[PDB]
């Protein structure tokens, strides 16, 4: 979960320092995200972290029928 | 927008803030289009308070997995 993100970064030979520099976010925010502390992360920060791992972050809201993208 | 979804659920900003047990200024920024600065747990509670569910997924090609 946190392990999944750690694995994704480590499979690309990036340190938490390098991902922090790629994402323009604090290394302390990289460590906390990787320790499972997703709840507390800001959206733009999580977005940047995931882009630095080569991913895309999809944030969606399901309300009854509809599902909207934020 | 969320504003439009919130309003469509008959709720006021003060009420959603109260129901989500979050600072109203937090709801104000989310509803004014500023999703970027929202903490995931804040956005999660705000969406639950509307009666909805928040999905956060990482996509790498066709591979996806949930974060929250």
Residue numbers in the entry:
A (entry chain A): 31 to 100
B (entry chain B): 34 to 101
Q: What does the original paper state about this entry?
A:
In the present study, we elucidated the crystal structure of Mycobacterium tuberculosis H37Rv HigA2 (hereafter referred to as MtHigA2), which contains an HTH motif. The HigA antitoxin represses the transcription of HigBA or forms a stable HigBA complex, thereby preventing the ribonuclease activity of the HigB toxin and the associated cytotoxic events. Structural studies of MtHigA2 confirmed that it has three regions: (i) a disordered N-terminus that is liable to cleavage, (ii) an α-helix bundle containing an HTH motif for DNA binding and (iii) a β-lid for dimerization. The antitoxin MtHigA2 has two binding partners: DNA and the toxin MtHigB2.
The crystal structure of MtHigA2 was determined from three distinct crystal forms. Form I belonged to space group P212121 and was determined to 2.0 Å resolution, form II packed in space group P43212 and was determined to 3.2 Å resolution, and form III was solved in space group P3121 to 3.4 Å resolution. Due to a lack of electron density at the N-terminus, ∼25 residues are undefined in each monomer despite the relatively high resolution. All dimers share the β-lid as their major dimeric interface, but the position of the α-helix bundle varies. When the different dimers are aligned based on a single HTH motif from one monomer, the corresponding motif in the dimer pair shows a different relative position. The flexibility in dimerization leads to drastic changes in the locations of positively charged residues on the HTH motif, including His54, Arg56 and Arg59. The greatest change in distance is that between the Nδ atoms of His54, which move by ∼7 Å [Figs. 1(c) and 1(d)]. To predict the physiological dimer, each form was submitted to the PISA server to calculate the strength of the dimer interface. Interestingly, all of the forms had similarly favourable dissociation energies (ΔG): −14, −15 and −17 kcal mol−1 for forms I, II and III, respectively. This suggests that the flexibility of the β-lid does not impact the formation of a stable dimer and is likely to contribute to function.
